[PDB]
TrEMBL record:
It comes from the Viruses. This is Genome polyprotein. Coiled coil: none annotated. The chain holds residues 2021 to 2488 of 2488 of the full protein. Residues 228-343 form the RdRp catalytic domain. It is found in: Host cytoplasmic vesicle membrane; Virion.
Length: 468
């Protein structure tokens, strides 16, 4: 991306500087590998020589690419050829209240700039009236204004989350960019029919967006197991390296499919975004500001175009003999005959700003990889022991082991119950170890262990949801 600093604005946006995370009663149940990210310069855990706000944008300002590399326009034509030839828009009412395959506006999220500086919550900008949300006139005016002549600021916040301890001391905390509510609804009107269509069939068009891993892991597994090899393709700084040339190609195709000229100038505000960080402002040329389900769809589409542009360079590529599955920067793919990830890294290094690296941190990719080796959405594909035709999404243990040791504003028992749905896919023995180790630590702290959903209950509910 390219960062262009702009003038300061008054009033600015109040940046979060106080974490809601704190140690849970289960703290110490597992070895401590993570701590909450540093949110303020005065945090004592920060290494003495480091400026926190400088660390937030290290991936950015490395450059932007405006010209297409070879195969990019051809790969996009191939990818979009499978789409319906007329994608519909959504009405403002459907964009606010949602559809069966698009969720309604979440009224508890912040409204973004400039509503936050005006003290106006998302809920204050709408009226609920027979169970249906309607915009207030001041917000309806900004929506129509954004559709016709978009101009709005993303709000930059610090991500309040657990980080590996070395990232805490180095101040390598991540940024969240919240789109304003009027820009979100306008984008849902222009792109919500595309989002509706894609989310209704997860795994189609190389996109897992909108999937439910408990149900769709079995579907994804059998669409990939027929390929002898399936590979991870991990990126470095994918959000920062997204080039303008990819955005312009997606604009041309989405405007053609949707048949509305306004989608190009809306997506142009994503490709060339404006941001407010406290009292400071800046422009980001290239790169992905996130903050939207539509940007997740756009990022996933751009990832499919970029991987396909490398795949078509291989002599053995066939249109009928490849499959990609992506969610933003997270990708797995397979081809018959196989096309090795090193072939993609070679093409990426020569023609593109994309940076792919092996998952193992090695200087080279694994020589062979199957559906059983890949990681997708932080989960492995593991067939059930008793019913091998059902596939478990097995989450990385460090996620729920570290997460149970920290708590936010919610009740601790509610956090434990929500983690049980993730942990139990590891199997009855690994699940019982996790429950037992949490129980022992909470017993030392409060003397009264929390309750855990039995493995037989979670497994029965999982099988019934797959057998329906």
């Amino acid at each position: 991306s390219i960062i262009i600093p702009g003038p300061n604005i008054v009033p600015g946006v109040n940046v979060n500087r106080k974490s809601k995370l704190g140690r849970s009663p289960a703290f110490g149940a597992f070895p401590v590998k993570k701590q909450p990210a540093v949110l303020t310069q005065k945090d004592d855990r920060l290494e003495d020589g480091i400026r926190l706000d400088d660390q937030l944008f290290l991936k950015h300002n490395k450059g932007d690419m405006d010209e297409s590399w070879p195969g990019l326009e051809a790969a996009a034509d191939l990818y979009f050829s499978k789409f319906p030839t007329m994608i519909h828009t959504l009405t403002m009412a459907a964009a606010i209240n949602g559809t069966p395959n698009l969720e309604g506006i979440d009224m508890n999220q912040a409204a973004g700039y400039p509503w936050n500086t005006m003290g106006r919550s998302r809920r204050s900008l709408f009226v609920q009236q027979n169970g249906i949300w309607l915009p207030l006139p001041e917000l309806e005016a900004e929506i129509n204004k954004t559709l016709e002549d978009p101009y709005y600021f993303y709000s930059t916040f610090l991500k309040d989350e657990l980080r590996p301890t070395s990232k805490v001391t180095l101040g390598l905390t991540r940024v969240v960019e919240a789109a304003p509510i009027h820009a979100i609804i306008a984008g849902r009107m222009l792109l919500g029919g595309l989002i509706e269509y894609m989310q209704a069939n997860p795994g189609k068009h190389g996109s897992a967006v909108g999937c439910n891993p408990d149900l769709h892991w079995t579907k994804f597994f059998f669409k990939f197991c027929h390929y002898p090899q399936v590979f991870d393709l991990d990126y470095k700084c994918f959000d920062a390296t997204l080039p303008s040339c990819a955005f312009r190609i997606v604009e041309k195709h989405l405007e053609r499919l949707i048949g509305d000229e306004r989608v190009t100038r809306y997506i142009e505000t994503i490709r060339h975004s404006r941001h407010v960080f406290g009292n400071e402002t800046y422009e980001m040329i290239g790169g992905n500001p996130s903050g939207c389900v539509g940007t997740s769809i756009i990022n996933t589409i751009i990832n499919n175009i970029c991987v396909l542009s490398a795949l078509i360079q291989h002599p053995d590529f066939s249109p009928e003999s490849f499959r990609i599955l992506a969610y933003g920067d997270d990708v797995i793919y397979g081809c018959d005959p196989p096309i090795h990830p090193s072939f993609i890294k070679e093409f990426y290094d020569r023609y593109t700003p994309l940076v792919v690296t092996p998952a193992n941190k090695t200087d080279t990719f694994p020589e062979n990889s199957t559906i059983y080796d890949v990681t997708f959405l932080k989960r492995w594909f593991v067939p059930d022991d008793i019913r091998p035709f059902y596939i478990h999404p097995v989450m990385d243990p460090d996620t729920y082991e570290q997460s149970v040791m920290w708590l936010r504003d919610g009740d601790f028992q509610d956090l434990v119950t929500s983690l049980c749905y993730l942990a139990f896919h590891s199997g009855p023995k690994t699940y019982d170890r996790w429950c037992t180790r949490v129980r022992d630590q909470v017993m030392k702290t409060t003397g009264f262990p929390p309750t855990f959903l039995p493995y037989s209950y979670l497994q029965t509910r999982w099988l019934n949801l797959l057998a329906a």
